[PDB]
Structures are given as structure tokens and as C-alpha cells.
């Protein structure tokens, strides 16, 4: 029974195809060895000996030129021992997704892209592709997943994201995904800038 190693991703959990992302496990407890498990299309466990600085052990795992297999729920385990790998509690799960595999969707803003403060804005994401689910990203990273609507009268598959009352602007992007390949996402929606005018 050991404390959960903390796993984070630099730059972010969204990684483009043929691009590189770094995943780091840090823990106040000092493990000589760090382990990382992926659940998905390709299950693999990667080992790197821990680097001990200050009073916190850390380890930088590199996910290479991004491909489909390297996407999934990554969990980091730690061990002070060597051969038996007496293992720590699982890290909090981190889902790494690949972007750019499928066609790009479209992002709209009702009422409008530029809005006064307090006026609630509901961004919407639509595409002709039969995407089962749409995902929204603010400033390069967000966690808002909503299911797609049925084949709309216009022939579209759409999901409405209610941002709520807007006081701080931001650049939002939208991605599309299927149920069969959950951690495999589409191209990026052309960025939309919510602009707040305040008096």
C-alpha cells in the first residue's frame, strides 16, 4: 500500500497525429522505478528509472510520433523495489487522445461570438460525419463531452454546448469522435473566439 503517484501530461492530453507528448509521474515518496500502463488498442507497460530531486521523485515518459495505439487511459505505478516491482497504488487515470484522424467539424456560437458580459452563450458543434460524440476544448484543454444528435433534418450531426453566462473570453475548439474508437478524435474545428465586452 503506497501513495498514488501523480501523473500529468506536458503539453496536454490532446496530442496531434505524428506529434510528441511527454508524460510525467511525480511523488513525494521516492521510487527508484516508475511504470506506466495503457488500456486500449495496444496495451503496453513502459519502464524508466526514477530521477530523485529535492524530496520528490519524478520520471519523464515520452510518447513518440503520435499514432493510434499510443492513445488510451494511461496509469502510472511506482515501486521502490527492483525485480519484484512492489507496486504503488494506481495513478489517477489520464486519457491521451489523438487528434486529426477524421474530418474537421464546425463550431458556432449562439447568440454571437462577441457578446456582452453576463449574456449566456451556447456554443454548438456540427458536422455531416456521423460522429457519435463531440468534444469541446477551451484554450487548448477542456473536459466537456456531449453526445451527438440523431441525423438532423439538415443532414447534420450536432451537439449543443451551453457555456453559460460569459464574463471571460476565450478561444474554443471542437473535435469529433466515434464510439468504437473513443480515444481517437478528429481534426480541430476552426477556432472560435468568444469576446466579452464589459461596461
Amino acid at each position, epitope marked *: 500500500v503506497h501513495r498514488k503517484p501523480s501523473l500529468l501530461a506536458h503539453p496536454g492530453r490532446l496530442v496531434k497525429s505524428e506529434e*510528441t507528448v511527454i508524460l510525467q509521474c511525480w511523488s513525494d515518496v521516492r521510487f527508484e522505478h516508475f*511504470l506506466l*500502463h*495503457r488500456e486500449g*488498442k*495496444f*496495451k*503496453d*507497460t*513502459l*519502464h524508466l528509472i526514477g530521477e530523485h530531486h529535492d524530496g520528490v521523485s519524478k520520471a519523464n515518459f*515520452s*510518447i*513518440g*510520433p503520435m*499514432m*493510434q*495505439d*499510443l492513445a488510451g487511459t494511461y496509469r502510472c505505478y511506482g515501486s521502490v523495489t527492483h*525485480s519484484p*516491482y512492489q507496486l504503488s497504488a494506481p495513478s489517477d487515470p489520464l486519457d491521451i487522445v489523438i487528434t486529426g*484522424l477524421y474530418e474537421k467539424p464546425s463550431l458556432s456560437a449562439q447568440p454571437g461570438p462577441t457578446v456582452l458580459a453576463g449574456e449566456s452563450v451556447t456554443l454548438s458543434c456540427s458536422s455531416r460525419s456521423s460522429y457519435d460524440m463531440y468534444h469541446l476544448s477551451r484554450e487548448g484543454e477542456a473536459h466537456e463531452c456531449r453526445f451527438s444528435a440523431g441525423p438532423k433534418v439538415n443532414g447534420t450531426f450536432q451537439a449543443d454546448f451551453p457555456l453559460g453566462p460569459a464574463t471571460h473570453g476565450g478561444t474554443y475548439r471542437c473535435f469529433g469522435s466515434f464510439r468504437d474508437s473513443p480515444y481517437e478524435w478528429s481534426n480541430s474545428s476552426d477556432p472560435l473566439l468568444v469576446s466579452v465586452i464589459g461596461n
Partner: antibody
Amino acid sequence: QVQLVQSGAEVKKPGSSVKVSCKASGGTFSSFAISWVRQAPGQGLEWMGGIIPIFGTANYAQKFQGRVTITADESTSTAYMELSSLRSEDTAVYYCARVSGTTGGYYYGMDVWGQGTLVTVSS
Amino acid sequence: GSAIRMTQSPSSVSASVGDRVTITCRASQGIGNWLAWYQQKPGRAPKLLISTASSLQSGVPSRFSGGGSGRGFTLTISSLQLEDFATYYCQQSYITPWTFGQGTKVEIKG
């Protein structure tokens, strides 16, 4: 001097089940990621599946999922492959090999191999 | 992503000793440099010759040389020798559906 010893050649009837053993020597069993490759008269080489390194779980190919289970035991230092429903076309030589790893999570190749076990599905 | 299909060529070859032969392996998708060439002599298990498209494993003669990138790859045996005569395959290491080429057979005429 990492080398792999496979179980002896076996001959079974259609509908039966076959279990092939892959003995590991020359290193830590947990570090190795072992995969099973089938060479059939009519099929050059096919990757049936493999075991993940440390935790011993398995990835399977879609064609062979449902009839193939790949297991391992650390104490035995041996991997196993089991074909549930034998079919006449499954007659082939079955190899076990360690797939090497490299930077970025990629695996680049299968460096070590085994002598192979031949199953012959005869009525 | 459907199974990355490797189309290997030629299907068979007959040549002489001290000879040069090239084997080409084409992919449906782009596998980068993540290709491998294997050699299998009869009975004996297949042996890895070249990894990472161009990296040669230990104990491999320099006459065995291979190159390529993206979707096109080659394997060039500069000086053919008797022990070289076998069947050669190519494998993609990109996406999980790991697929091998059909194979190329090298034979001595004598």
C-alpha cells in the same frame, strides 16, 4: 543469450484445443514482451497477439480474438497460447518471439525467436 | 484504421553468387521508419536482419542493406552468397494490426 524454447509438436483433431508453451531464459521474464506469430502454408506470417511486459495481460488480433488466449506465469518463466476451436486451416507452425522496445512507446522488432511448434489438424 | 496492408515484391527471385538483388515492400498507410526485414531459412526460425527501416542488428553482414521511408521501402543484398539464399519478409511496426509481407524467395540457379 536470451533464448526461447517452445513446446513439442502436437497433432490434434478438429474441434479440440491446443496449448503451446514458450520457455524463457536469459533475462527477467517481466521485462520481455512476448508475441506469438503463426506461419501457415498459404499465409506467410501473421501476428496473432502478444503479452504486455510487466502485468502479463494480452493484446489480440481481431481474427484470432475469441479462440486464442495468451497467458504467462512468472514462476514458470513460460508463456502459453491456447487455440480453443481447432479448424483444419489452423494447421500451421506457431512461433513465439520477444518484441523489442524503443523510445516513444513504439516496438521496433522481434529480436529473439523460438524453434516453433507445429499443430496439425487432421480428421 | 484498417489493417495496414504490406505489399511485398518480388514474389520470387533466382540469381547467382556474388550477386546484387533488391526487394521492395510497400504499405497501404504511412509506417514511417517503423519497418523491419526478417530472414527465414527452411526449418530454422525467422531471424531479424534490419530494424528501424535501416538499423542493422548485430552479426548482420554489411552486404545486407535496406532503406526507405513513408510507404516505400527496399532491401538490397549487395553480394549474394550461398548462406543468404532463403525467404525474406517485411513487417510493419506502426499500428497494432501488425502485418507481414507475402515474402520473397531467393534461389541459386545451380
